Design a protein around this ligand. Structure first.
Ligand SMILES: Cn1ncc(C(=O)N2CCC2)c1C(=O)Nc1cn(-c2ccc3ccccc3n2)cn1
Ligand SMILES: [Mg+2]
Ligand SMILES: [Zn+2]
Length: 313
């Protein structure tokens, strides 16, 4: 109740900024998350005993992979924290509860492999869930952890409020499937430009929430250049491991996953910032103007990758 989490001065200030890096001290990340829930949601949203037990169960069910790990989870929750805090009056009490939990849980039990590799491997999960394979798994993992004795952080919601939050979390996690982003952002673009966008329309809020999830998921591209560059190594470590596994099945991987084409990474980054990241943050800034700092950092990082290609680093 009267127990607040407090951060050291530099963190307390820097955590409010979009480009905050959560640091290399794993043992501080749970406290960083609880801090963000308390400021974003209230010290009443969750029983602290249950929240702490939920957080530690979520951490245990993230694997020791180079990128899709517990640090990614907390990083993606922080970006959502920053969006929510810069957009106070736009989101409901339920949405603010659900979305930080959704971000913490969005890659639960990730093995570091794409939906593609699961399908070509003929992994059991690709028979259970024929599209958004890993994302349906991440939501299933979230529901299972919530149902562990003492882990139901939502228990003090009403029956209807509980159903609404689980549906917010389900849609939020499914939307982190990048295959679904292109269509989602096209529809948001058409709607904002014809002016038909209506945030009282539930189907419209769903689309906007989904774009916020893509924005948060991709947020390594919105950090200081050294964070962005050092995260890129972790991202490619997984992609290249996946390409190795493709070659073991007798399939030449796409260049993205071929460690033989290390050289082409800078040009692949331009394509990705131009095809995915920049349009994601542009449409987000059109719908929620206070998220402009993400667009600006993303553009700065595109310019840095341009500088690497020109051999100036
Ligand atoms: C930075 N970032 N953050 C998230 C993701 C992502 O997609 N994720 C799904 C899991 C996270 C990325 C990313 O790098 N995507 C990407 C990189 N390329 C390319 C394309 C052609 C290439 C040719 C040669 C070498 C490298 C290449 N790379 C295409 N898409
Ligand atoms: Mg994912
Ligand atoms: Zn993710």
């Amino acid at each position: 109740g009267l127990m607040q989490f407090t951060l050291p001065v530099r963190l307390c200030k820097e955590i409010e900024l979009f480009h905050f890096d959560i640091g290399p001290f794993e043992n501080m990340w749970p406290g960083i998350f609880v801090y963000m829930v308390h400021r974003s949601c209230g010290t009443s949203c969750f029983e602290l005993e249950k929240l702490c037990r939920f957080i530690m169960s979520v951490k245990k069910n993230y694997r020791r992979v180079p990128y899709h790990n517990w640090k990614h989870a907390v990083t993606v929750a922080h970006c959502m924290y920053a969006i929510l805090q810069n957009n106070h009056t736009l989101f409901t009490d339920l949405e603010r509860k659900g979305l930080l939990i959704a971000c913490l849980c969005h890659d639960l039990d990730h093995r570091g492999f794409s939906n593609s590799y699961l399908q070509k491997f003929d992994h059991p999960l690709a028979a259970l869930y024929s599209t958004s394979t890993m994302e349906q798994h991440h939501f299933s993992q979230t529901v299972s952890i919530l149902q562990l004795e003492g882990h139901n952080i939502f228990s003090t919601l009403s029956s209807s409020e509980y159903e609404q939050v689980l549906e917010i979390i389900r849609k939020a996690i499914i939307a982190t499937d990048l295959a679904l982003y292109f269509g989602n952002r096209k529809q948001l673009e058409e709607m904002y430009q014809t002016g038909s966008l209506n945030l009282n329309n539930q189907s419209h809020r769903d689309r906007v929430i989904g774009l916020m999830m893509t924005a948060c998921d991709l947020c390594s591209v919105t950090k200081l250049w050294p964070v962005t560059k050092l995260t890129a190594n972790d991202i490619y470590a997984e992609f290249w491991a996946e390409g190795d596994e493709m070659k073991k099945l007798g399939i030449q991987p796409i260049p993205m996953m071929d460690r033989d084409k290390k050289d082409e990474v800078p040009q692949g980054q331009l394509g990705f910032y131009n095809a995915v990241a920049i349009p994601c943050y542009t449409t987000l800034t059109q719908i929620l103007p206070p998220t402009e700092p993400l667009l600006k950092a993303c553009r700065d990082n595109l310019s840095q990758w341009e500088k690497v290609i020109r051999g100036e680093e």
